[model samples]
Target chain A: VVSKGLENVIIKVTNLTFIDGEKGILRYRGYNIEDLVNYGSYEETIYLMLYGKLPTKKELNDLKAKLNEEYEVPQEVLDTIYLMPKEADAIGLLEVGTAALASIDKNFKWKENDKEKAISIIAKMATLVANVYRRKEGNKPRIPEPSDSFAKSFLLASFAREPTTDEINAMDKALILYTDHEVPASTTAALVAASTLSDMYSSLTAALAALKGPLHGGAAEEAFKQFIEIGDPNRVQNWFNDKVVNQKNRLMGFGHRVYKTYDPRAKIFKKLALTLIERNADARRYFEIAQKLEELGIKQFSSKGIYPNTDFYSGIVFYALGFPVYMFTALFALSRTLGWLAHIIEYVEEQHRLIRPRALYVGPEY
Target chain B: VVSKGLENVIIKVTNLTFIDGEKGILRYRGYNIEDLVNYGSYEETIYLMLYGKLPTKKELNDLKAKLNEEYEVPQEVLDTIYLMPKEADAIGLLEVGTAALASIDKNFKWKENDKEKAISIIAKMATLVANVYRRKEGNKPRIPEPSDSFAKSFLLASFAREPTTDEINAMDKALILYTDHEVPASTTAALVAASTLSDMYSSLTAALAALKGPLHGGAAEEAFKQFIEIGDPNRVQNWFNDKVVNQKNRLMGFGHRVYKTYDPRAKIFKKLALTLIERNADARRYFEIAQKLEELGIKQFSSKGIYPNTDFYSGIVFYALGFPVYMFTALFALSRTLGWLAHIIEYVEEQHRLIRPRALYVGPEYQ
Candidate 1:
């Protein structure tokens, strides 16, 4: 039988991340995602994901230094961003930007499972993403400060201003929570590229390419757009009835393929969204509308094994920060880069193989 | 069981190509490789590979016109090629060059299985590839002449001089022969990208990315390196013995995962290499050395169903064409892109789904 999407086909054994679709649980390297988010930072979580354990204080500092060293995107990547049309989508620019990274290092192919390159890309990815907006506004790209956290540097670069502690913590939690899931489309695409033993940058390009899909990484922005449409909190019920009920429009962030019960990240993102909305007067209305919709969504989709996933509330968390809707996927991709690299490094350092699946010919008879 | 590398697992049903490993038979849309190489041009074969039928004369002209319209790489793409370091691999530069195409079209993400964009990409890909070398040598990118064939334009742009009919036909046949095969690593990577409904440029970028892998598309250059090392034709047997028999080095380009009898394209490329090597005094030695190695390879490994594959002679075929060894995979990727796009469009147009697979947890328990 042809596995159309390789839906349930287990392609490999991974020590990085684990998930239970029926239970809506996720763990990275044997640690609960919630615990990691509560007690960990994105940098520490990245270290945990990459090496299968928590980093010591000095180890974490060293990791941060490595990320900071490459905080400025290489000249070629920046020029690529500059050459792109201002109207180009951030995700598209990210794809080209990472591909241009090949120019600086002639030995990208010579090295396999390269930790230094992996760290460099992760460090520069945030700056490349922030520069997509920086170029749009005619502002120079921001460099990471010596004292900044990964989340803080990105927030500062993206918004061009320091954020409050609540915003930084919320961003950190979101990064940790969305850091990984077990072999989603984006991760699977990266794995397929890495299975060919391609370099980390190319694998990341594949991941970003897959994340451009509407069914995958675009959900947060699509979910946020509905909030803008339901401008008034009172309209949430009518909008839900007219769009989701009568028109049978998909409730974008209310379901997932791997999560049936309440998504663990959704609860965390929901709290973050509430905390951020409380600090802002305008976005509080969207949160109100979202809360009513969540109650209605649970009332409606819960019986059908569709509950809110991580993206259900993550959109508002991003919106509550001063981000435009288009930058949602860019941030998501920047965060997911950690997990993509972890899996790629693991596969390549181990016994990687060229991932060529068979195709059963069903066309005209030869 | 974990299907590591997804070996032998059927991912989808395809109508584009069929392969029988045991019998060493391969066909694209029910047409044999030899017939296509003998009777077809690269433009017409691309039409067949993409649309599953041969194009009429009128239709062929129409495709030629479409390809001609995109003969010049976009300014941004040209600038990207210029910006890349001269020492970067041609394949790597090609990857970034295609990624830069996203700058020109805002609607790339909106279109589904776009035939027009596919045609435009097929047209521009060769020019971008040709420019990778042109920029290295400080030559302006060449535009396709109205009278030029697909192969001639690329050859002119790459080498910056006119070529004879023999060279053009040899190039055309090589393009057709290497156009597509059943899903290889590069093709599968492109399929995985397209399965996400990613744009064609992004999908092409993924294809080039996988092609960078030494195990996948780097074989031709690796195979050629051995030939250069075995400079004299008389040393072929000794070189093979030392590298293969004693050192356990892989006999590059001498085996296939899908073909046990013979790779159909190998015979055609072997002839192409022979025809070209005859006219060139320097390249003739490489051909003689290759022949000796081929005979030696068959004697040693033919019993294990190992025979020279297409890349076996394709390297020398390229070597005879005055192309550098580094540009082999770039040329290979440029030709195979036709097949990659065909499969991508087919998969996206036909009941597409997200190409995600499960991963069994082999990590630590909750601590």
Candidate 2:
């Protein structure tokens, strides 16, 4: 048995599908993350994570149908949202709303016992998150129209209006880009929650809480806010110089704890950021400023071994896409939902007990 | 440097608080967890975590006042809850509500930059959780009537429609019992989240999610369900024996991963359970059945080295006390909130870097 709090055990498994923190390399199911960014939509990525490979045309169609089928938020859940304090975070509304929705299934207890039913609960959570965006903004939540794909329907539900084709494409790419980044704390928390066989709502709540932590996923929005505060490209050098001069802040996106070289996802995001820049010149301005910040960050911190991370320019892409800054992390939830599902499915298959890691207790001992 | 997928340096610290599995002891601010459970209220326990010592009468009064001062959920937040689906788990409501609350605070943005504002946010969350409980239950959340003590007010707000004094007392003791445990996965998740310099809500949501897992706080409810399903005392031995015979279901509370000896919290909770059992003879029946199950479980599983955990008896206590099975986990959230806050504070002071543990790459390499 692993001794309590002494040393970490490396869990060897064959079924998981992703890796991270390496320079110039990231993959899922033997496919490069860069390739997925270029050619895969979020749906395709989710399919890969779930079924463990790319889907056939029919399989994709069926999967889309299953996701879209549950896209409609139950009216009861919406009513709960309506009753929630209006200033509540839309993310919380979604999280709580999904949990509240658990009650609607009166059969939730029975369903929790059924694996297929559990999977469907997860699918519905995706729909609930998008619905939260709609309802929180006071728009009528649109039911997923059969003709619309899952990504498009989600956008439709979120914006409460049809998206421009380009916008939908941006969201698709964004979702793909954010889909999974190995097993971060939040994803581990999700798996840990799922291991307890907690109903999907409780597990999802735990996962959202994890995502809200900047160490796990909320930093993109903070990065965006900082970029906006920095304001102009002309000031970028002086601002960064002074930031280093005073050590005022750790630039949100530049350095990562892992990945001594470049983050593979950052490299892919570099391309996506370029695409967004090319699509909108106004957006290009933010990218140019970020690029400058990246160069400056490297000059200052590279010797100390910090490099520009994937989050460095993610905010610009997200901002240009018209997402409110607050929604950035929740969107990470949407993208990483696939990663969460994959981990849960893997855990279920393995029948692992609750993941109670040994902690090196650093406290007063009698 | 810690190499890829390899264990690195062993860390040793001497400052903070307790550990359960190894020494099998629990403490808060130098007071034993058992002592707190016996004589303290949840409010008293929270006061310890926040202020670093058991409270004097005046200090306790002052802290209760501060918590009560924040009892009123903002109308906008109430409206937000009004807009939320009632079917939402109370925990989820808290996540979204807390995040939104974070946004509304002008000081919230500066929380990462400012220390004092951060403390206020932490205090506000406890009050917010109490308020969320009231709103979701569709009860008129009682504003902390200063006349009532902190624990009493929280109980009243939560079970509003006026719970009996006995019920309130039971809930109070339950909260005290639930308040703190050794650093488990959720507490670690909270500390890791806080290290990101994320606001309290962000850290809390993540921690709450971690707690929601059955491996953590959710087990009590699950174990309670198992007890209810067993139904009668006379039938338990056969029921447990058959399950052991079949090797089908693992008894939820029978064996804990951490404790080899009896879980100390289980000992404390057993006292509380015995109290409730005596009050309600029907509850006594369930306790007898649970006790018999434990005896059999120890005989069967002890050979394999498993012992009944704190969760084993917790559900029986909560069930006997008339808490709905769903509320069992929520009660855990209520109690553990103190631990979460204490741990978060400790992390802030230490200023640890973001916790990013390296995982072994078990996935396919790029083709």
Candidate 3:
């Protein structure tokens, strides 16, 4: 008999990342998620995930240089974005432009072994997300600045202003936290695409499409909306009872399929959100309400294996960092692009079979 | 234990199409594929595949009218194609432009039940493929002729000339043959995408991306290239001995994963290719060589459950219709769009869970 939803079914062997749901542990290339989030930069963490080792000083420098070199997207991609309807969502625009990037690059087809292509893909994803933000802001598009860090470059390119140091650090932390998780829907989608020998661009495009689903990457935005609906600390129990208890609605970001305890990434983001709200007065109310809700949520549902997940606090932190609620998932996409590429390269290197699965015929026969 | 690649796994139920590879049977909404290819129009076959029954006269007429109405692609999509590099392959361009279509349609997000959107998607896919051909040929793109059949409109738009009745019929037969297969890689990719509640455009885009792989839809084009390589009928034995017997290379179009017996679709395309080559002198040589290769292939591998599959004659028939080899899979994508939509609609109606699966963690443990 087939395992429905493939729950706990081991599909393939992957060396990229691992998760122990019982222990609520996640590691990328044998490095703990907490250490990487606290002590690693986004460029270094991405290099580690893809290459399977933390970079030496020279290796990290060279990788950064490569990413910086590929920061400016092709002009044709920019023109296509300009032609897109202004109401287009950021992730959808990113998917289209990313697929188009393959057409413009003459070397895209033959550069299967070239890590520079991987670097360029990672770099351009951030640029595309930022450009989508700029276009939505009704402002002219901007190119990446070489001197800025990856986080700073995105902030500068998107908002056209220098971000404070804390802002840059916060974005970098978010990037590290969201860099990789083991075989989630979007990553598995990428693996499936790559198993067919599709190009990295095509695989990433497929992944971006999967991530747009509400069950997957849209959780952060949904969690943020829940906070707005709750609106105040006093309304936490009433909102929780009405929406979650009485109506049997599942609280967004309160539970995870894999984690029975608090998500490790969520713990870090919780601390980061506390720091961010202290500086941004407009976001303080949401954070205070979020804190109350988390406390009450853990008290009510922790025995049932429902705890505050990463999306519960990451959405608040992204809001505190000046990103619109809609762009939250796009940020997740940009950060997770490296993880997708890592799994893709790993799958290709192992020379695995095509990821074709059989379906039991439940339909009537002719 | 988890099943790798989900072999023999029952992911979900579907009412759209069914396949019995051992018997070489394929059906769409309970209608045999051979019947559809022989007597049906592409428009009617597509409607049946999507809606679960053959359309009445009025229903078929409305489908054709609706298809004709949506044939002209968005101008912005055309402009984006123009901006694409001339060296872009047809599948790549089709993928990019299809993803872009979601942005142009205001109702794309909310219109899950709107069959009009499906109709427009199908019509525009052919147009996009033709436009890619035109761009590759250094010619300008042209609008579709509403009065023409789906096959004729594609021929007219792509080559900028009207096609003969036989040519249109050949294309129509090819289109019908390639319309749907139950749960192939590309179709499964669409199911996986739609399982996540993604829109039709994104699902189809993912399907197109998966179809571009060499093991899937590209097999037909590869088979066509093999014919060109063989070139002469007399040289078939030497090429076969060298490639298949000596070096142990698998013949591209000779066998299929599922079809152990003769493929029913390949049977129809073989006949269609024979009729087409009689009229197309240039395609005659390839068909002759292909015929020899098939006879030899069956003689060699038929006892081993290897026979000429759908891609065997589909390439030759496509060549006879004056399509470039690179565009073969894009044509497949255009036709298979309806099947993908049908499965997507069925899956959404069932309201299944997201198609997430588990993987074995072979990486190192944390401290």
Candidate 4:
């Protein structure tokens, strides 16, 4: 009776996010994911996640101000990132950055400074990711710019240029979509660390590393690689027939653990990817390949309740918006930091239980 | 039911360690804990946990040679430790050091290089703990010394001086006793991270941080502080009455999650603590107070099936060996690293399942 993967095993009662996978519905704190993505800033959505209810205008503005104030990461953490092997995975570097950040501030605890630390981590995540990217490219990290919006400021720091309004909105939706998905592997890792009542920095460190595993965070990057490997829009059918059907290769990013219909986030990312591709002439071929492949995947998998997930189009959206493939998991890490912390703060505030499951000894008896 | 604290809920089938809490019995890879502690060195016990059997003389020497080669911590990792805030917890510093060790060796994957990395991690843990100790004391870390035995080398590095043979044996027995206890909170953290196929360094990082939790690692230190607070063995009854019977304060190290009788490790630690206390005149007072307090705790709660567990005696044992109260958890970290890595190597080699659990959303509903 061992629950091997803990699949469908409700380990904890969480009120933060909900998904009806069969019906293809997703919501965060009572608002539909679509409504949240369309209506407000990521700052407001972050407030909804941390404070449980939607924030008032005053609360939202205050959080934004706090996030703006904490935008600059300390130089020591930057140096630590620089010390990491440039060839290392970006997500793993983020994991190191998170742990290194722990030694900087001694007084920060989840219970004592939940909101401030949450906002601080959220602000610095982009900085850490951007800095890791800078190091990966043999450049030094620059100061973070406090821009007009969360997505705008983040893209400015990461790409060193301002994203247009359309690009900003698209990136913002991607962030909100990737923010939380109930308790995935990374979130579970975070909760497991946070259950020790350890600092939020360490919990996020656990989450970042968990996300680095191939089972969790690399799908979007892999899916985008497929589009690149296909090389042309017209080649998509032949590629699928040869690689997937004949070669018996499993297509990446086409299915998910919880989604039986189209992933709601995938629908949003599809639109975002299409918008970016429509604007960027150089990115048009990959989008067409992705779309053609999606139709073929649907014809094959739709009846079995498998379809394109967020990883499918989200990869294209990220690439078209000026992010390289190496930075995709870091993007997900930055977006999901708020969600990890929000769950941590929530669990700490109410029903704080240490998550320690025992192992049944099934080995030889001597 | 919520299964809060995951009370007695077995999640995976592991052969690495076993515990019969009701019987106060513990075993590692089919060898009884007490027998393992009595029969061989901590290195041999580590080999048992890792290879799932007692190693031959040749296998034992091979592991010792491998451990010797990895004795030195990378200077960059030392600098990382020095950069940490001086007042930060040593266990947390170990966590940071473990993560920092990740970038130094890019090719070290758990499945590909399990035994070498396992031995290397076990060797450097003592150096990391020792260097962290040196930093707290405002000194530069010296290079690690390749000494006669695992505990001897570890103590020589950590204490920066050698202990007598009797003292070394006591320390070695203490290390064996604290090696593994079958999937504690910290082990669970390590396994969860390893389940994702993360590197051993990152997995150990996860384990170290979880060990820093108040529920896990602080008890032994707290138990020592109580003895120091009592100050005299004669004051034990009054202190126990005020702290336990009348004031209704929870005794720190006496109770445990699993054991209903005497904890198996606690028995060995009780003997180890006494042997050290007898040899050293300074630590005898605290050991007496601990023994008296244990009697009081046993008298009060033994019928209720609560008794002195490992923490009750482990604190005094660590203190007698010249380790400061702050170093207690790190000492546990260095010993338990083997257990954590052994379990990780076991799980990674065996089932290799991704451990993702679903959550029951009991929160708000969309309009």
* Candidate 3 local Cα displacement, residue A14, angstroms: 1.9
lDDT of 3 by residue, A133-155 (tens): 88877878898777657989888
Over the stretch A235-316, how does candidate 4's per-residue lDDT look in tens digits? 8888999988899787788887789999999999888877788776657788888889989999988888888888988878
Model 4: docking quality category: medium
Pairs of colliding residues, candidate 3: none
What are the clashing pairs of model 1? none
Instruction: State the weakest 10-residue window (summed lDDT) of model 3 chain A.
Output: A105-114
User: How far off is residue B107 in model 3, in Å?
Assistant: 2.2
Write down the lDDT of every candidate, Cα atoms only.
0.81, 0.63, 0.80, 0.81
Q: How do the residues B31-96 of candidate 1 rate in per-residue lDDT, one tens digit apiece?
A: 877778888899988888776798988888898888888887668888877888888878778888
Quote the lDDT for A359 in model 1: 84
Residue A239 lDDT in candidate 4: 93
Ranking by DockQ: 1, 4, 3, 2
Could you arrange the candidates by TM-score from highest to lowest? 1, 4, 3, 2
Show the colliding residue pairs in model 4: none
* Residue B91 displacement in candidate 1 (angstroms): 1.5
Model 1: per-residue Cα lDDT over A1-366, one tens digit each: 687788778877788888877877788988888888888899898778776679999998988899888787557778877887888878888888888886556776534447667778888877887888787667776666545688888888778677999989988898888787778777877877788767778878878877766666688877778888899998888999999999998887888777889989999999998789976766788788888898999899899998887777888888888777788898888788888988888887775777888888776655
